[PDB]
Design an enzyme around this catalytic site. Sequence first.
Site: not given
Ligand code: J5T
Length: 216
Positions: A20, A26, A163, A183
Amino acid sequence: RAPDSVDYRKKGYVTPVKNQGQCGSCWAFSSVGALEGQLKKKTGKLLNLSPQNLVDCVSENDGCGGGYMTNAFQYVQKNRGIDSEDAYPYVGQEESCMYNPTGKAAKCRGYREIPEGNEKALKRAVARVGPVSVAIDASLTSFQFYSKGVYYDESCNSDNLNHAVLAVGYGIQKGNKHWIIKNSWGENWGNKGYILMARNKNNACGIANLASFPKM
Ligand SMILES: *[C@]1(O)CO[C@@H]2[C@H](Cl)CN(C(=O)[C@H](CC(C)C)NC(=O)c3ccc(-c4nc(N5CCN(C)CC5)sc4F)cc3)[C@@H]21
Ligand SMILES: [Cl-]
Ligand SMILES: [Cl-]
Ligand SMILES: [Cl-]
Ligand code: NA
């Protein structure tokens, strides 16, 4: 009675390990891995689907800022398709959504969520359905340095999911029950891109806390 062990890699349901890069995508790799497994199951064809399509187009998610697999499955459903990797190649930065219907390689007609925290339900889903999208705490240095054996670390925090990966099977190694996890940090990480994570050790690293799969 559900199988004692399952390995979808042996069945040709799993594509090669991807990287990625430096994007928080992820969630998109996890999503496409689950879709890839259902496509193989349903049509007999194994092909790489497009994480970039998801990153660029799932507007309820935050692109490289992170996302949820459920949101991704919902988008693929509402969009009436997801492109192949070849039609929508991975860039590792968010760009404007440019979905191409001619490159459509899979469809989704909804998704289901594994009962929260239940590893037995997760086992049965992996057996009954195919590869499952899962979320974990992958923040520990022990995780980063994984090379072999069954990963277990007491400092893992199942309330700090950070993650998204893919459960492609389950089994036992030298007395230790495990999940076979694909992964998205490339082939050089872990054991050729995979890690065996402890199974039935009280939901280690939150493996069964936010698991889902697409309907096809
Ligand atoms: C992966 O590649 C691993 O590292 C990255 C971060 Cl640390 C964690 N991650 C994720 O994608 C993670 C996966 C879940 C299943 C644990 N999710 C999130 O971190 C995540 C979900 C949702 C949002 C999110 N932000 C939104 N907004 C941001 C702020 N504005 C004001 C509004 C919209 S909408 C939305 F769904 C962010 C992060 C990645
Ligand atoms: Cl069982
Ligand atoms: Cl078991
Ligand atoms: Cl663009
Ligand atoms: Na949503």
